[PDB]
Amino acid sequence: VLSEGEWQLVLHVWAKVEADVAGHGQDILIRLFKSHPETLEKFDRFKHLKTEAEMKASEDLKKHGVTVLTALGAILKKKGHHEAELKPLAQSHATKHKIPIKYLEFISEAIIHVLHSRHPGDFGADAQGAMNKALELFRKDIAAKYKELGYQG
Ligand code: HEM
Ligand SMILES: [C-]#N
Ligand SMILES: [Zn+2]
Ligand SMILES: [Zn+2]
Numbered sequence: 801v802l803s804e805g806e807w808q809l810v811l812h813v814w815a816k817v818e819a820d821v822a823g824h825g826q827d828i829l830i831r832l833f834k835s836h837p838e839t840l841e842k843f844d845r846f847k848h849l850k851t852e853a854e855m856k857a858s859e860d861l862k863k864h865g866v867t868v869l870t871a872l873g874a875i876l877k878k879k880g881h882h883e884a885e886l887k888p889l890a891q892s893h894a895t896k897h898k899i900p901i902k903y904l905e906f907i908s909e910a911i912i913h914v915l916h917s918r919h920p921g922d923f924g925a926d927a928q929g930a931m932n933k934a935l936e937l938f939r940k941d942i943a944a945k946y947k948e949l950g951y952q953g
Contacts, residue, residue, distance in 0.1 A: 811876065820918075827918070828914050911931070
């Protein structure tokens, strides 16, 4: 479990994202899709996008980035007490969207990478450490529900 000091770090950083949630979401999704193209294929909604310019121009992609980071923000603000928030996400990602846990690792690395872009004067080492712990806890708990459902090794 994260310490309170580590949660403080997580949420300080998170408040940063909230200054421009759509901008952060955009950059995170694009970094995910470009770094790991197998992920884009999982989105019927986005798979027509063939270049980073097209991705940056997509208003719908930006709208979806806000849905994603709104859900993740809410989970982080529960400081590990996120059973009710995670249940429907693990269910739809395992059984409907068919997203492997590996891809949740990729989007976690994209989140970290986009922070090294947007908060390069904060996002200190301590904060990077805590954010990776928070995202690992998120993946651990989703993986446990994947396994229950026959989707996690
Ligand atoms: C930080 C991790 C993530 C969070 C918080 C998140 C959150 C969400 C939410 C809130 C929705 C809409 C509700 C739902 O369908 O349950 C959704 C939809 C979706 N997610 Fe995620 N997601 C994450 C990671 C991923 C990843 C890594 C992928 C694929 C590589 C993915 C694929 C999808 C797809 C395909 C949809 C349906 C989009 C549509 O067609 O409208 N998700 N996600
Ligand atoms: C989900 N994006
Ligand atoms: Zn990849
Ligand atoms: Zn990556």
